[PDB]
Amino acid sequence: SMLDDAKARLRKYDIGGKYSHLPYNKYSVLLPLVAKEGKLHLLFTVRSEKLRRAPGEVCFPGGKRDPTDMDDAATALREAQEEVGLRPHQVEVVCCLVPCLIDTDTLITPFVGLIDHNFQAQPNPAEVKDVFLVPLAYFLHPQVHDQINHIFEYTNPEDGVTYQIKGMTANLAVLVAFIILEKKPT
Ligand SMILES: CCC(CC)C(=O)Nc1ccccc1O
Numbered sequence: 610s611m612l613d614d615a616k617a618r619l620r621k622y623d624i625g626g627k628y629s630h631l632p633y634n635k636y637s638v639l640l641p642l643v644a645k646e647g648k649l650h651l652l653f654t655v656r657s658e659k660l661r662r663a664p665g666e667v668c669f670p671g672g673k674r675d676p677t678d679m680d681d682a683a684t685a686l687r688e689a690q691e692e693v694g695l696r697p698h699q700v701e702v703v704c705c706l707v708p709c710l711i712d713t714d715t716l717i718t719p720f721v722g723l724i725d726h727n728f729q730a731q732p733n734p735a736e737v738k739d740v741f742l743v744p745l746a747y748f749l750h751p752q753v754h755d756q757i758n759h760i761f762e763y764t765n766p767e768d769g770v771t772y773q774i775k776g777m778t779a780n781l782a783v784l785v786a787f788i789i790l791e792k793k794p795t
Pocket of ligand 1: 636637638662663668671672673711712715717
């Protein structure tokens with residue numbers, strides 16, 4: 610099937626725990642895959658205008674590891690629960706993609722998760738101003754804008770609202786699209 614095909618592709622790129630013990634400042638992100646209307650979508654957040662770091666920006670759910678987390682995947686699941694109400698029975702963590710090195714002392718680890726069809730987002734307004742879906746196929750032919758720095762613009766045809774997606778978030782989206790959608794009969 611569509612969902613079984615996605616997980617089997619993703620598993621070939623799983624690095625597992627290989628880099629997880631290194632002595633960095635540690636953050637995790639969850640890349641949430643949702644099936645709607647016969648196609649795969651990614652779920653994004655818009656960060657609250659009140660936050661210290663990157664207020665108003667598009668990002669995946671995520672945050673800083675804390676002492677309660679059993680491992681890096683637990684960080685990503687805790688944060689997703691707090692930000693959008695995703696419960697653990699509603700997500701299957703399929704793999705761990707290549708981590709992102711920043712600022713010389715920080716390592717951000719991305720996990721891909723398959724989301725239950727009955728999940729409905731409950732944005733926590735102290736952390737998240739908006740939640741939206743983008744079809745995975747968009748990231749193969751994006752609408753690009755140069756700020757020189759590449760910025761994707763996505764307009765939701767439901768309401769005509771435009772979102773800007775950039776940086777690590779945009780890079781990870783393209784990576785997941787390539788993994789899952791390259792070389793497929795139509
Ligand atoms: C903006 C939220 C995101 C959560 C994973 C974050 O805090 N990133 C980050 C961490 C350390 C240095 C720079 C950064 O952008």
